[PDB]
Paper text:
To translocate on solid surfaces many bacteria use dynamic cell surface structures called type IVa pili (T4aP). T4aP undergo cycles of extension, adhesion to a surface, and retraction that generate a force sufficient to pull a cell forward. The T4aP filament is composed of thousands of copies of the major pilin. Here, using cryo-EM, we solve the structure of the T4aP of Myxococcus xanthus (T4aPMx), which has an unusual large major pilin called PilA.
Residue numbers in the entry:
A (entry chain L), C (entry chain M), E (entry chain N): 1 to 208
B (entry chain O): 157 to 208
D (entry chain J): 53 to 208
F (entry chain G): 53 to 104
């Protein structure tokens, strides 16, 4: 071999140093998104058990008996009722003053700037189906005043990897269908199946 | 009066032969209670501490 | 190093890009097959409760009190009696005209081409055991005319991953034994244990 | 997870890092190709079935805004009768979807013309030609329909 | 990158292929052990009902009315009285010649080499408490001759996963305490609570 | 990469620079020898086993 071959060898190792391999942060974000699914299905289960025992759905996480373990990355909202969001910013959880409809993000181990004290998801791209005319307002609907309550509606809000913006999930007791968009999938969603209104792995910005 | 799992504090139940209504709180539910139905005044699953 | 080493590095990456890993679609199909087990055991339980209260088994899912949740992937048949199979092709379930002996696949969220409106399984490789001489016909046997009814027989039919063909399950109130075959296991089956007559993970085609 | 294949890269969860040199198409559905012509990626308006070449660091004249490869020399094998149209086939209407089909398009060194790749979920066989290899291709193995290292010009 | 990196990648996948993950057969054995708990509590309930109606405890499973469903994995002994153990080695259960004090393992669907025709558990590590001076001999004690019978004592015996040796349980009508050992837990046992004398998940061999 | 040797110079990826003085044959298979008789190299009709 000659000088040109050897310089080409050097240039090839330089090329491999700057190779453009797949973005695996997307894969790791998809890995992290499973907290939302598991915890929302736990919320569904607890709501069903509470209704069975009490003939009514609940607007608060205290009565349902649902709480995710620390390190959650996601803030969970059980209803739009008034109250604080159980801020998790210390080793010891605070003593509640009243029923809590929302559970904040665990900012103890993720930093103070990562806090989510109002974990209300986006529901623009979830369309309820059926003749019962259900809405997209979170919580027990049409009102908690009807003991044979129509199906509840809940959701979560979080951040996957270093996305400045959030990803949103919803779970409903009724059938609905998703809409196609820059940050969501199209297809019918069975009752009790989490749906990703904004996934944050596809998009980052004003996209919804 | 008892204790569920590793709660330092207790949960409380009552049963009455007369009608009553529960009050909303950090550790209790709101709604009317028929005579002969146990009511959980403090449930210990929702809260642990000074909460009642 | 020299040119040959560097081209060998490139070729090794080409090799790893085309490596032959295990087929994990089979593992996921085995994951999806658990609906059939859970729902068939629920069918068994509901049939036993119905007999206990009424001194007789039923050929209809209305009377038993059994219905899987939406998104089931499997059609269930409680009997061979006449009647429509509660087609699940819309958000609102249809109002029945009479007792339904079969529950169709949930084609609302799986597409219209995936519909299973006649979920009758294959029972060739299930051999009832015992002197009572039980048959493999689905439903209450020998007839619902005998209130101390001999044990029932029921099954399910579905599709796991992208198999064009189906996998079939059965559950019986009486003992039986499985036969070895291209798509089934050999061994004795206790009463109340689902048996996979055709699994659809081992095979796809005319194999039974 | 979903019992169906996708025609959009945003739902799949796939995106190559910057400096890719290759444009990728996951389907022939309608939509823009996520033009990578600036430091900050654009906000999509809808689902994107194609990812353009990263012309930010390779120049504006090197842009590939429609990375549809050549598929003349890939022959699907099997009785299922699969096609060479890119995307989910025969159509996304069948949730037990038949295998997808995808590809890429790029330029190696100073070739004026491009080189093309395909990856399928089904079996196929390559055809001998001026710019391709002959032999059977297993499912999930990339195949080089036009390699651009052997040829440059009208050759396919 | 260079050759060393690529060979290190190959070596790392080789490492992962031989990773030492937790032994999950122990978790599955713990899952399988629930038959013993449920069926022993059923024995306890049936014995209590029989006493209430008849003012005496029974030494036979026929009179009590207790029989586990097929596929039991465990043999149950209600007394040490003489008699056969209702061998479950065929689809049709045998017609009993006389009262049966024991129920054999269901070897119909577990194989002939897994038969347990004498399911007498180990009782070395169960110490009765109280001034009444109760014993560890299985059955109605001190004798069935006293109608205000002192509390009964029963147990089960089985095999979890591929342990060559067996695991043993006991349920008593009187208070007792466990003894710490290689295959048992230490702590007080309330009357009517099954206790695992040898668990077979912790140990396999001569350990008791 | 492919678990087989090639009969053609197209697939291997081998071509000497212009001014080579030597003709190279990688196989005896049928095909033309990539005649280098002009400034622009010809477009091949099929795999070439030899380089003129």
């Amino acid at each position: 071999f000659t000088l040109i071959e050897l310089m080409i060898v050097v240039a090839i190792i330089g090329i491999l140093a700057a190779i453009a391999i797949p973005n695996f942060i997307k894969f790791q974000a998809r890995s992290k998104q499973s907290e939302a699914k598991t915890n929302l299905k736990a919320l569904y289960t607890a709501q069903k058990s509470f209704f069975s025992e009490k003939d009514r759905y609940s607007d608060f996480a205290n009565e349902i008996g649902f709480a995710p373990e620390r390190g959650n990355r996601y803030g969970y909202r059980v209803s739009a009722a008034a109250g604080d969001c159980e801020v998790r910013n210390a080793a010891d959880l605070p003593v509640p003053a009243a029923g809590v409809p929302c559970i904040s993000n665990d900012s103890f181990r993720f930093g103070a700037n990562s806090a989510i004290d109002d974990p209300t998801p986006v529901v623009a791209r979830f369309v309820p189906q059926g003749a019962a005319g259900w809405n997209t307002t979170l919580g027990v609907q049409p009102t908690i005043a009807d003991c044979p309550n129509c199906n509840f509606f809940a959701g979560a809000r979080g951040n996957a990897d270093n996305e400045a913006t959030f990803d949103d999930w919803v779970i409903a007791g009724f059938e609905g269908s998703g809409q196609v968009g820059p940050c969501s999938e199209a297809g019918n969603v069975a009752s009790g199946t989490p749906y990703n209104t904004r996934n944050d792995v596809a998009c980052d910005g004003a996209a919804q």
